Design a protein around this ligand. Structure first.
Ligand code: NA
Lengths: 277, 99
C-alpha cells in the first residue's frame, strides 16, 4: 500500500517520542513520599535551551550553592570532586571505559545515561543538555522548564543551536527512529489511495528562513506545562516551510509520505533548526 | 536534593520521648544537616534532654516532653551544597511539636 511507512516512522512523533517537546514532563516519579514530574521523551530535542528572563546568567550555570545568590546560578548540576558535571565526551568514554553497555553509546545517549547515574540503588534521573560545540554534557539539576506568570521559559534561541535537550529516556537508536535533519526539496503529506496528498489544513505563519519556522513549530509543539497535562506527544509538531513565499505551514497530525517540491523544507519541533539533507 | 522529617507530624504527650529523623534524598558530599529549636539555638549531639544523632545523609532529633518544649527546623547547608531543592524549594523541613 504505502511505500513510505518505514521511511516515515521517525516522524510519528507521538509514537517515537511520546512526551512533550516544548515542555517535557511526561513521567511521574515517587521519591520519599514526594511526587515529581520528569521529562520522558524518547527523542532528543535539538536546539532547545532555557531562557532565564531578566538575568544575565546562562541556564547552564551550576545551581546556586553556599553563599551564592539564587539569581547568580542556573539549572546545571553543582561542582563535585571528582567533577561529575559538566563532563566532556572523551572524559565520559574514559569514565565508563570498563562498562561495555555505555562506553560506546551515542554521545547524546551517553549524556542521558550519565545524568541518570548520579544516585546508586534514586528514581530521580536528571535531564541533560549536550553541547556539540564543546562536546560537553551538562547535567540539569533543575528539571523545570517554564515559569512564566525566578521566571524562565524554554526556547530555541539561535545561540542554543548546538544544544540538545535530553530526557532520561533518550534511546540509543535515536538517529534511526527520531527526527533530526530537515528535508530539502520535500514536503510532508498524507498518503491516500496510492498518492501522497497535501496536508488538507495547515496554520500559516510568516517566517524569514527555516530557523524561524522551526522555532515557531517548537513554540507550538506538544507541551506538558500546566494526565490532564501530559501531552504524550500530541501537538503542532510538524511544519512545511515554503522558502519562496516564506511560509511556515504548521500542522498537528502525523505525516505519512513526502511530496517532491523544490520550494519546501520539511521540519519538526524535534528537528535541528538549521541542518538539512 | 529533598529534605523531609520522617515523622512529619509532631504530636507528643507530656512525659513521652520523641524521635524525629531528618532524611535528605539526593545528599551531596558538600552538604550538612543541622537541627534548630523553636527558640533558634542550633542543637548539637551533646545529649541534653533534646539532642541529635548523625548519619551520612540523615540526622535524628531526640526530644521528657515538657509542655513548654514546643516548631523545630532541619536545614541542609554547605559551601557547595545546593541552595534549592529539586522542586526549586528551600532546602529545609519543619516539624511542629504539640504537647
Ligand atoms: Na522511499
Amino acid at each position: 500500500g504505502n511505500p513510505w511507512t518505514e521511511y516515515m516512522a521517525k516522524y510519528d512523533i507521538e509514537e517515537v517520542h511520546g512526551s512533550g517537546i516544548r515542555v517535557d514532563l511526561g513521567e511521574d516519579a515517587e521519591v520519599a513520599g514526594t511526587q515529581y514530574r520528569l521529562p520522558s521523551g524518547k527523542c532528543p530535542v535539538f536546539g532547545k535551551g532555557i531562557i532565564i528572563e531578566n538575568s544575565n546568567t546562562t541556564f547552564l550555570t551550576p545551581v546556586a550553592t553556599g553563599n551564592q545568590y539564587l539569581k547568580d546560578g542556573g539549572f546545571a548540576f553543582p561542582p563535585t570532586e571528582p567533577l561529575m558535571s559538566p563532563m566532556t565526551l572523551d572524559e565520559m568514554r574514559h569514565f565508563y571505559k570498563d562498562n561495555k553497555y555505555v562506553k560506546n553509546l551515542d554521545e547524546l545517549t551517553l549524556c542521558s545515561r550519565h545524568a541518570g547515574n548520579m544516585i546508586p540503588d534514586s528514581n530521580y534521573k536528571y535531564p541533560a543538555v549536550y553541547d556539540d560545540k564543546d562536546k560537553k554534557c551538562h547535567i540539569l539539576y533543575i528539571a523545570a522548564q517554564e515559569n512564566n506568570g525566578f521566571c524562565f521559559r524554554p526556547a530555541k534561541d539561535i545561540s542554543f543551536q548546538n544544544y540538545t535537550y535530553l530526557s532520561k529516556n533518550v534511546v540509543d537508536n535515536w538517529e534511526k527512529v527520531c527526527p533530526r535533519k530537515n528535508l530539502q526539496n520535500a514536503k510532508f503529506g498524507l498518503w491516500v489511495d496510492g498518492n501522497c496528498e497535501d496536508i488538507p489544513h495547515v496554520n500559516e505563519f510568516p517566517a524569514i528562513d527555516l530557523f524561524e519556522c522551526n522555532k515557531l513549530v517548537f513554540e507550538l509543539s506538544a507541551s506538558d506545562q500546566p494526565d490532564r497535562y501530559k501531552s504524550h506527544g500530541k501537538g503542532y509538531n510538524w511544519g512545511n516551510y515554503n522558502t519562496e513565499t516564506q511560509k511556515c505551514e504548521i500542522f498537528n497530525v502525523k505525516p505519512t509520505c513526502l511530496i517532491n517540491n523544490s520550494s519546501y523544507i520539511a521540519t519538526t519541533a524535534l528537528s535541528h533548526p538549521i541542518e538539512v539533507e | 536534593l529533598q529534605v523531609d522529617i520522617v515523622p512529619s507530624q509532631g504530636e507528643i504527650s507530656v512525659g513521652e520521648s520523641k524521635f524525629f529523623l531528618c532524611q535528605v534524598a539526593g545528599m551531596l558530599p558538600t552538604c550538612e544537616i543541622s537541627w534548630f529549636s523553636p527558640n533558634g539555638e542550633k542543637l548539637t549531639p551533646n545529649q541534653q534532654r533534646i539532642s541529635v544523632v548523625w548519619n551520612d545523609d540523615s540526622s535524628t532529633l531526640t526530644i521528657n516532653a515538657n509542655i513548654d518544649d514546643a516548631i523545630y527546623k532541619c536545614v541542609v547547608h554547605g559551601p557547595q551544597c545546593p541552595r534549592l531543592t529539586w522542586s526549586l524549594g528551600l532546602p529545609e523541613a519543619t516539624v511542629n511539636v504539640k504537647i
